Amino acid sequence: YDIQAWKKQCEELLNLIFQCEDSEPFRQPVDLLEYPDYRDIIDTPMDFATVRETLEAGNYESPMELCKDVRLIFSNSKAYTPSKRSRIYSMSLRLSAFFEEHISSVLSDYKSALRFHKR
Numbered sequence: 001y002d003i004q005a006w007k008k009q010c011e012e013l014l015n016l017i018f019q020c021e022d023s024e025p026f027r028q029p030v031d032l033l034e035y036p037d038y039r040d041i042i043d044t045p046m047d048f049a050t051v052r053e054t055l056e057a058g059n060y061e062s063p064m065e066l067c068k069d070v071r072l073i074f075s076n077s078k079a080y081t082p083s084k085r086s087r088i089y090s091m092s093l094r095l096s097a098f099f100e101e102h103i104s105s106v107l108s109d110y111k112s113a114l115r116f117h118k119r
């Protein structure tokens with residue numbers, strides 16, 4: 001029932017994601033000079049270094065907010081490269097499955113702790 005436990009759990013899951021080779025294209029913002037039409041398609045760029053920095057700055061109130069930003073990394077990649085046969089699409093699907101598999105208990109434990117607090 002630890003209301004704060006999600007933060008270190010998210011730091012550890014981000015460490016695992018950075019160690020995955022599938023995270024390479026997502027570790028820093030998409031270079032706005034290599035893909036000059038990126039902002040024509042993507043309104044809100046997102047990447048794992050921005051997520052880690054937002055978490056470390058104390059600028060997420062809950063793991064649901066972190067989860068929303070991570071899901072935005074994958075929806076941005078699917079919008080910019082829609083081909084299910086592209087290198088980035090297949091890496092996105094694998095990394096997203098890994099992330100969702102691990103974030104599920106973090107969200108459940110956080111929500112359970114808040115319900116216990118307000119019992």
Ligand SMILES: CNC(=O)C1(Cc2ccccc2F)CC1
Nearest residue numbers: 025026030035076077080081088
């Ligand atoms: C998340 N990155 C992307 O969406 C792009 C760049 C990119 C894709 C694949 C591998 C290296 C890469 F640099 C297409 C813009």
